[PDB]
Amino acid sequence: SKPLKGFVICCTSIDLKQRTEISTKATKLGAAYRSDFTKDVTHLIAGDFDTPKYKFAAKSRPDIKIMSSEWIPVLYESWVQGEDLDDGLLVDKHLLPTLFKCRVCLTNIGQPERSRIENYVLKHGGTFCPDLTRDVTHLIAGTSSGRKYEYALKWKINVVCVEWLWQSIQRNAVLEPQYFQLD
Amino acid sequence: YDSILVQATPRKSSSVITELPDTPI
Ligand SMILES: [Ca+2]
Ligand SMILES: [Ca+2]
């Protein structure tokens, strides 16, 4: 009858057209839809991590599931084809990757730590960057010196300790950089 | 509960045009 009864869905950094598609199909599935991020939101469909909505969910609402943009269209298509939906409602198969849109660079960290960090960045949906460029989102710095570090500061790129990575992975969300500032 | 934690992202203003792109090839 209504597979998404009890769900309350909100979007962040989703283009208006795809937002209307999600809004209409989620409502058809029995969910409620919110344009504002209200207290009763249960699922946040996100197209970026650098938004006030994403940041609030990551900071304060671990109960809220952060979903990729194709979750509702895929779920809707399966239902409208009369396929049988299990209890999970495909939520786990369409969680947004933890490091979605992250481009991670490193400095002042030895081997074998460098190889391990790259492994986990890729495993959680991010891009690993051997060179620092202007579109790097996070520079993991073992200490606050060297050319990568100085130019990250010049270019206004986040500089964090490696605990940013481990705790973002454990939290299943990108955490804000000031929580992981050096010194 | 409809208390607003974070407001919806505002639709961007028209913004005065300052650049016209190279004609695509
Ligand atoms: Ca997405
Ligand atoms: Ca840690």
Residue numbers in the entry:
A (entry chain A): 4 to 186
B (entry chain B): 626, 629 to 652
Task: Show passages lifted from the paper.
TOPBP1 and its fission and budding yeast orthologues Rad4 and Dpb11, respectively, are scaffold proteins that mediate formation of multi-protein complexes in a range of essential DNA replication and repair processes. Bioinformatic analysis suggests that only three of the BRCT domains in the yeast TOPBP1 homologues, and four in the vertebrate TOPBP1 homologues, possess the required cluster of residues needed to bind phosphorylated peptide motifs. Despite the structural similarity of these phosphopeptide-binding BRCT domains, genetic and biochemical studies show that they are nonetheless selective and specific for the phosphopeptide sequences with which they interact. To gain some insight into this, we have determined crystal structures of segments of yeast and vertebrate TOPBP1 that contain the two most N-terminal phosphopeptide binding sites (BRCT1 and BRCT2), in complex with phosphopeptides derived from a number of different known ligand proteins, including RAD9, and used this to develop consensus patterns that encapsulate the individual specificity requirements of these two independent binding sites.
In these complexes, the peptide backbone upstream of the phosphorylated residue maintains a consistent β-sheet conformation, and does not contain the tight turn seen for the hydrophobic triplets in peptides bound to the BRCT1 domain of TOPBP1 or Rad4. In BRCT2, however, the size of the recess is restricted by the side chain of a highly conserved tryptophan residue (Trp158 in Rad4; Trp257 in human TOPBP1) at the C-terminal end of the α-helix, and can only accommodate a single hydrophobic side chain, requiring that the peptide chain continues in an extended β-sheet conformation. Sequences with hydrophobic residues at −3 and −4 (and often −5) as in the RAD9-pS387, Crb2-pT187, Sld3-pT636 and Treslin-pS1001 (993-DIGVVEEpSP) peptides conform to this requirement, whereas sequences with large polar side chains such as Crb2-pT235 where −4 is arginine, or Sld3-pT650 where −4 is glutamate, do not, and are restricted to binding to BRCT2.
